[PDB]
Amino acid sequence: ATFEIVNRCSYTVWAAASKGDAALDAGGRQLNSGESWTINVEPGTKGGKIWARTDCYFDDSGSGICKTGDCGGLLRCKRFGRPPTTLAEFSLNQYGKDYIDISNIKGFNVPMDFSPTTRGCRGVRCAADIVGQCPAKLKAPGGGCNDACTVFQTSEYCCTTGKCGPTEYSRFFKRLCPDAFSYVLDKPTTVTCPGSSNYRVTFCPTA
């Protein structure tokens, strides 16, 4: 499957793409404002994620640090990133269908649109000013708005027992972005697409 990753933000982002135990394609790249990066993701990939990292510094060997979404200090991510990270999530060719969603379960750093470039389904977006409206306790100094599980590490926010409910914090993400997962047991906002669809992930789709 092909994914075109577009940075429409006025600032540079370092895109990342991983399935948790391996990079997807190159795994990461710098995207200046307006740049597009096309990646190929193997059919049948389960649990893939794409996210943006902000305020990165990398040396000649691709080692460094980002203020949001750092994946063990690598430019080319092999693992998932440190919250806060708005996430584009996908599982491809699962019994003839692709499943896509946007998640705020690991917080929010950059607004995003995740849409198919092929026919058969709709896209999802979370483009509200979550960082600007972020509750004081969830604000991340490096930038972004953390989820409550990252901040407080309780069974209720992390849904550790598999029984949790919405919270004051999850309702904040849900009010601003109804089409994104706000907590582990949220009513699914997953979109089913035809198997082998192609997609575009756009950072800052409105601004």
From Swiss-Prot:
Sorted alphabetically, the keyword list is: Cytoplasmic vesicle, Disulfide bond, Signal, Taste-modifying protein
Q: Does the keyword DNA damage apply?
A: no
Asked if the Swiss-Prot or TrEMBL record annotates the protein with the keyword Signal, the reply is: yes
The principal localisation class reads cytoplasm
Q: Name one Pfam family in it.
A: Thaumatin
Annotated SMART domains: THN
Listed PROSITE patterns: THAUMATIN_1, THAUMATIN_2
Q: Which domain of life is it from?
A: Eukaryota
GO cellular component term of the entry, any: cytoplasmic vesicle
SUPFAM superfamilies annotated for this entry? Answer: Osmotin, thaumatin-like protein (SSF49870)
Where in the cell is the protein located?
Cytoplasmic vesicle
Disulfide pairings: 9-204, 56-66, 71-77, 121-193, 126-177, 134-145, 149-158, 159-164
Q: Which InterPro entries match?
A: Osmotin/thaumatin-like_sf, Thaumatin, Thaumatin_CS
Family according to the record: Belongs to the thaumatin family.
Job description of the protein: Taste-modifying protein; intensely sweet-tasting. It is 100000 times sweeter than sucrose on a molar basis.
Q: This chain belongs to which protein, by name?
A: Thaumatin I
* Organism (species): Thaumatococcus daniellii (Katemfe)
